[PDB]
Ligand binder design. Structure first.
Ligand SMILES: OC[C@H]1O[C@H](O[C@H]2[C@@H](O)[C@H](O)[C@@H](CO)O[C@@H]2O)[C@@H](O)[C@@H](O)[C@@H]1O
Ligand code: CA
Ligand code: CA
Length: 125
């Protein structure tokens, strides 16, 4: 009753999803794509990664670009109260990168990528 819990969805290519497909999946089970709003949540997700041996994997988070006057937003509506972008990111590479992915290594860094790319994902509930 006092927290959301996180769950990794590491998938082979035949079951990977776009950002929107991943958001729809997490919402259909009663949650949303995961937001990382502070260092505590970052640590919780890193611990899940260490527990699963799911090392060096990339995962969709709930980061998505809104209108120009909103900038990057979290799908769950939470504030962008913490940022852990990789160096130079977000860079909107070739003008087509509007969704955020986690690099699931010890840096736990974020990168904007094309929303239609197939990826693993993380839900919260
Ligand atoms: O592929 C687009 C991506 O390319 C470059 O990033 C590289 C690396 O730093 C990333 O961690 C991995 C995983 O996304 O992708 C590339 O190998 C950068 O130009 C990056 O901004 C861009 O999104
Ligand atoms: Ca949160
Ligand atoms: Ca990028």
């Amino acid at each position: 009753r006092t927290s959301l819990c996180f769950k990794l969805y590491a998938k082979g290519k035949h079951e990977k999803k776009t950002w929107f497909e991943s958001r729809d999946f997490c919402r259909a089970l009663g949650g949303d794509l995961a937001s990382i709003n502070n260092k505590e949540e970052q640590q919780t997700i890193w611990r899940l990664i260490t527990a699963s041996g799911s090392y060096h994997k990339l995962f969709w988070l709930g980061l998505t670009y809104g209108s120009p006057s909103e900038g990057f937003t979290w799908s769950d509506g939470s504030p962008v109260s913490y940022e852990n972008w990789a160096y130079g990111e977000p860079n909107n590479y070739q003008n087509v990168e509007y969704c955020g992915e986690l690099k699931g290594d010890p840096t736990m860094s974020w990168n904007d990528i094309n929303c239609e790319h197939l990826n693993n994902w993380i839900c919260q509930i």
